[PDB]
Amino acid sequence: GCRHVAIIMDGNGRWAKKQGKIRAFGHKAGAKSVRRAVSFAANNGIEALTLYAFSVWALDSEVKSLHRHNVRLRIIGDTSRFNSRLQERIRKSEALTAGNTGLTLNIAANYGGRWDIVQGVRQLAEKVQQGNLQPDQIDEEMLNQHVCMHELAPVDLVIRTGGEHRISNFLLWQIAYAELYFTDVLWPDFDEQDFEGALNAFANR
Amino acid sequence: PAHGCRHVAIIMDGNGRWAKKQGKIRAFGHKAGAKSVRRAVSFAANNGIEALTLYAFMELFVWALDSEVKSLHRHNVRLRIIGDTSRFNSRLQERIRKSEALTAGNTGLTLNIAANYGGRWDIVQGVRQLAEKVQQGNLQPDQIDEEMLNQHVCMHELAPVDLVIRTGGEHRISNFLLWQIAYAELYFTDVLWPDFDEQDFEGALNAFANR
Numbered sequence: 286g287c288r289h290v291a292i293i294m295d296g297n298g299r300w301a302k303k304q305g306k307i308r309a310f311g312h313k314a315g316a317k318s319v320r321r322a323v324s325f326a327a328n329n330g331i332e333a334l335t336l337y338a339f340s341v342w343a344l345d346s347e348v349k350s351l352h353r354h355n356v357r358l359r360i361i362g363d364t365s366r367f368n369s370r371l372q373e374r375i376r377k378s379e380a381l382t383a384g385n386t387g388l389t390l391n392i393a394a395n396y397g398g399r400w401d402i403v404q405g406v407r408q409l410a411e412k413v414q415q416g417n418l419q420p421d422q423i424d425e426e427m428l429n430q431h432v433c434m435h436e437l438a439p440v441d442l443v444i445r446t447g448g449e450h451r452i453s454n455f456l457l458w459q460i461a462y463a464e465l466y467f468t469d470v471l472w473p474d475f476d477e478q479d480f481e482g483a484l485n486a487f488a489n490r
Numbered sequence: 491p492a493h494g495c496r497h498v499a500i501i502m503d504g505n506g507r508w509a510k511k512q513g514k515i516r517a518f519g520h521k522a523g524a525k526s527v528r529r530a531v532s533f534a535a536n537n538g539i540e541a542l543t544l545y546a547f548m549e550l551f552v553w554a555l556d557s558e559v560k561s562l563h564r565h566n567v568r569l570r571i572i573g574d575t576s577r578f579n580s581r582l583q584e585r586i587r588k589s590e591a592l593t594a595g596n597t598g599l600t601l602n603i604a605a606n607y608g609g610r611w612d613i614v615q616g617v618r619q620l621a622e623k624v625q626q627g628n629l630q631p632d633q634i635d636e637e638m639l640n641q642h643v644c645m646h647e648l649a650p651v652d653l654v655i656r657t658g659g660e661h662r663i664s665n666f667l668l669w670q671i672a673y674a675e676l677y678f679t680d681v682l683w684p685d686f687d688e689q690d691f692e693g694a695l696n697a698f699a700n701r
């Protein structure tokens with residue numbers, strides 16, 4: 286069974302252009318597709334769902350709602366430049382939902398897979414400097430403990446919408462053994478049948 | 491070159507399944523697969539590719555160097571093995587080193603062979619090297635960025651990987667290159683590796699140019 290799905294949500298801009306409408310309009314139907322995919326994952330017993338915007342201030346309004354649905358919210362990515370009022374909103378949102386036991390929802394914000402690895406490297410380098418760790422002691426498992434989502438089920442399936450066939454520096458370390466699923470369907474149109482189409486692909490491998 | 495493609499990497503899968511369909515033992519898939527390796531190398535060499543990296547998917551079948559090294563050298567191909575070679579048995583280590591040494595001055599295709607290679611291990615050995623420089627106080631932790639780690643992973647001095655091909659129908663990287671394929675085109679085909687020919691390769695190059 287599929288435990289942890291990651292989705293690259295591409296196609297909002299193309300979609301808007303197809304409908305002879307501006308970017309703004311695509312983002313908003315995109316947000317609608319986010320809620321449906323979240324709901325579909327929670328109702329189908331997926332443990333973790335990780336979303337990458339490829340094509341945050343709008344998460345204030347959705348948090349109370351996620352909490353009641355027993356959803357644990359996390360933001361992965363570099364939030365250190367972000368102004369400190371938003372940093373503390375993200376912190377409160379995380380804190381509010383952290384004891385929740387349903388779907389863990391990871392939102393990648395200013396995330397890059399290379400950045401993710403490097404930040405973990407930096408941490409082991411600090412340890413080496415301090416005298417706490419020898420070079421030859423560093424192995425896969427220890428680096429794993431310092432990259433994003435090490436406490437979750439490993440990523441089983443990566444879905445990319447919108448037609449491109451690339452990871453584009455989303456998760457790198459984490460997807461060594463994931464099924465990759467590429468669809469031409471643009472993010473605002475990706476619905477429950479597309480999502481199940483992708484879980485199918487994973488079951489057939 | 492018109493196709494835009496400097497560095498192709500291939501996951502060469504479907505050899506086992508190819509033999510089974512024929513009603514043949516695995517050994518015949520390995521032979522058929524080895525022929526298709528030679529065909530993909532020649533084709534890469536004649537269509538202007540700078541770099542071709544192969545993931546072959548006891549081990550002493552790997553003494554397939556001595557079958558091919560003279561031939562590669564005669565096609566002007568520069569050979570390099572990537573992966574953890576340290577646990578290999580002394581004479582195998584020397585046949586690799588000599589094979590590499592023999593072809594290092596060649597100016598055609600650079601051909602990389604993954605042997606006991608994994609994408610995670612690759613990243614991990616680059617981090618070791620960096621951790622050494624930290625400890626032998628050359629390096630500040632806060633100086634480590636992407637470009638730096640990038641110079642310590644395999645093949646850092648080659649053109650970045652533009653295109654990954656996997657034959658055999660599965661849609662996964664299986665711990666082949668990870669760091670290096672952040673921005674690569676991924677192309678999956680159901681064609682089994684022994685059947686993958688010039689036209690299929692041409693097929694992949696054109697779709698890359700079109701995308």
Ligand SMILES: CCCCCCOc1cccc(CCCNC(=O)/C=C(\O)C(=O)O)c1
Nearest residue numbers: 502504505506507520523524546547554558
């Ligand atoms: C040029 C220097 C030598 C290159 C190193 C390897 O040399 C090879 C020799 C013969 C055949 C191949 C083709 C791939 C082996 N088959 C699989 O991995 C098949 C599966 O994983 C599967 O069938 O599921 C490669």
